[PDB]
């Protein structure tokens, strides 16, 4: 019974952990500070795996101490232990505490713990029933610190339907809850629902729907970093499809910054994959360092070969990646943006041709870009000249392209513009850092002269005048 002894030893400490978190939730209302709820949800992923059938049963039938319809709801959905030798009655509530109903804060929290276990137990149909039941409890309530708990409940309530593969019935509930959260100025709740809605729309390729939502809804500025990161990614993916690459790159780069530093590897891979394409779509260059990371090396390898093909500006090399990694891009949700890279491959290849050749024949351009015929390269280079891609001219009669003499870039306003976007950002950090400095509320004006010691000079200086002068 070595496994039983170790498991029961791990079961009781987790029960104590749940007791501590609920105490914080109860004390959050007592102190009227909703931020105390966060430290209970801070350890929520830690407690998510640290519970089993026995752990749930002890908590749910011991925390409530009142056999209401709630206890008629969640006990039947979990297994019960036998007559164990160590019958430690886990009853945190005694006397008036046991008789009094549980706060709406904690009954949602314990119910969420049951919902999470149903997720880990693959009882998605059963999880939906409890999650649906939990959805009525927090909808009727209008508490303020419950908004912090409710946001986590909404996140998992979309998760049960994610495994149920419906994702459509929850859209009505998310929109209705979002308006409820927005009208109540639910900063944390509004941020989570907006992210969940964007995931809902992006799952069914409703990119038009999500663009409209982000165009009107205002994301909470005082939102969590983990919730901001999803919004930046979802908006960045939205901008990428709408050919708004410049604003997409800013958000995706921002999403990586606000991502967790040690966990959420899968999120990092997804954002890295999309940022590489957007960076290639914008004509810029992906950072070589991101392909070196141990976690990203295997995932970004198809995109690493894609970036190499785009770099050379060769159509044949770009197409070879397509016929080889086409299915991986499709299964990755980025196949559409890779197709648009064919125009970019032409763009970069023309750019080096103009940057390396003062006068190049059109047939040579077609060979270097692996186009079909020089006449097709004629229009391709012509559009590059009108678009500002390359400063050059075409001699149709002679059949070559003459690149313009490169102008001294330091004698232009371009260095000032590049510095301005760099100078103003440096000044922004200083202002942000200074505003982030906190002075603790120490007892000011106490480092001054003490009342007793300041009196010491007056008595002594009185004798100084009363004796030296006489």
């Amino acid at each position: 019974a070595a496994a039983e002894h170790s498991q029961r030893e791990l079961d009781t400490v987790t029960l104590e952990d749940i007791k501590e978190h609920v105490k914080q939730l109860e004390k959050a209302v007592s102190g009227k500070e909703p931020r105390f709820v966060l430290r209970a949800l801070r350890m929520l992923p830690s407690t998510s795996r640290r519970l089993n059938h026995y752990v749930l049963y002890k908590a749910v039938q011991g925390f409530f101490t009142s056999n209401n319809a709630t206890r008629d709801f969640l006990l039947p959905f979990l297994e019960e232990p036998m007559d164990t030798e160590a019958d430690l009655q886990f009853r945190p509530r005694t006397g008036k505490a046991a008789s009094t109903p549980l706060l709406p804060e904690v009954e949602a929290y314990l119910q969420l713990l049951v919902v999470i276990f149903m997720m880990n137990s693959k009882r998605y149909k059963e999880a939906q029933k409890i999650s649906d039941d939990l959805m009525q409890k927090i909808s009727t309530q209008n508490r303020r610190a419950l908004d912090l708990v409710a946001a986590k409940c909404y996140y998992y309530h979309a998760r049960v339907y994610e495994f149920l593969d419906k994702l459509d019935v929850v859209r009505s509930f998310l929109h209705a809850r979002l308006r409820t959260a927005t009208l109540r100025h639910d900063a944390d709740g509004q941020a989570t629902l907006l992210n969940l809605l964007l995931r809902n729309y992006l799952h069914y390729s409703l990119y038009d729907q999500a663009e409209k939502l982000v165009s009107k809804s205002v994301f909470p500025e005082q939102a969590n970093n983990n919730e901001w990161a999803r919004y930046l990614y979802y908006t960045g993916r939205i901008k990428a499809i709408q050919l708004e690459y410049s604003e997409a790159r800013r958000t995706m780069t921002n999403a990586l910054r606000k991502a967790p530093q040690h966990t959420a590897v899968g999120f990092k891979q997804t954002v890295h994959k999309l940022l590489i394409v957007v960076e290639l779509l914008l004509g810029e260059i992906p950072d070589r360092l991101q392909f070196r990371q141990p976690s990203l090396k295997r995932s970004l390898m198809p995109y690493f070969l894609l970036t190499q093909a785009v770099r050379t500006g060769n159509l044949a090399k770009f197409n070879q990646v397509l016929d080889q990694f086409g299915e991986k891009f499709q299964a990755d949700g980025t196949y559409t943006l890779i197709i648009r890279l064919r125009h970019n491959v032409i763009k970069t290849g023309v750019r080096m041709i103009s940057l390396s050749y003062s006068r190049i024949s059109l047939a040579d351009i077609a060979q270097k870009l692996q186009l079909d015929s020089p006449e097709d390269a004629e229009f391709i280079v012509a559009k590059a000249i009108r678009d500002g891609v390359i400063e050059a001219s075409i001699n149709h009669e002679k059949g070559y392209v003459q690149s313009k003499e490169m102008i001294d870039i330091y004698s232009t306003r371009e260095p000032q513009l590049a510095f301005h976007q760099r100078i103003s950002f440096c000044l922004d950090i200083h202002n942000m850092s200074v505003k982030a400095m906190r002075f603790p509320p120490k007892s000011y004006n106490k480092d001054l002269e003490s009342a007793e010691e300041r009196r010491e000079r007056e008595q002594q200086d009185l004798e100084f005048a009363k004796e030296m002068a006489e």
Partner: protein, 137 residues
């Protein structure tokens, strides 16, 4: 069976968020004001403080009873001085540096200890430091 009870609660909770935000912001600013106010207040009091006579520097010969200490003021020979109520007599060790008040010569601070006489003696002798690695044969 409520009237504008929901309307009132919406109004009250609306003001609470602004009040809590402004109250937190005000406490930030009050500490900023207090820190600057303390700097100004300490600066004006410093001018009066700097006019207070400086303390003598003496060397403790030995401690005596009733919190008496025999010291040697640098140019002015030996004295028997009191000990300030904030200074423990047990920390007054022989050959220690102490600060004495201007008029009462009261021992009011134990200054950092001077150079040890042996260290001072070995500084002028200046025997070159050596290890076994720099000895050959």
């Amino acid at each position: 069976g409520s009237g504008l009870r929901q309307y009132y609660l919406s109004k009250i909770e609306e003001l609470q968020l602004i009040v809590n935000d402004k109250s937190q912001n005000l406490r930030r600013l009050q500490a900023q004001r207090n820190e600057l106010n303390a700097k100004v207040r300490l600066l004006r009091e410093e001018l009066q403080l700097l006019q207070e006579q400086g303390s003598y520097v003496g060397e403790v010969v030995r401690a005596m009873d009733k919190k008496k200490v025999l010291v040697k003021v640098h140019p002015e020979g030996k004295f028997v001085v009191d000990v300030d109520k904030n200074i423990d007599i047990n920390d007054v060790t022989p050959n220690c540096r102490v600060a004495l008040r201007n008029d009462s010569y009261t021992l009011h601070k134990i200054l950092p200890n001077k150079v040890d006489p042996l260290v001072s003696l070995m500084m002028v002798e200046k025997v070159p430091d050596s290890t076994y690695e720099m000895i050959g044969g």
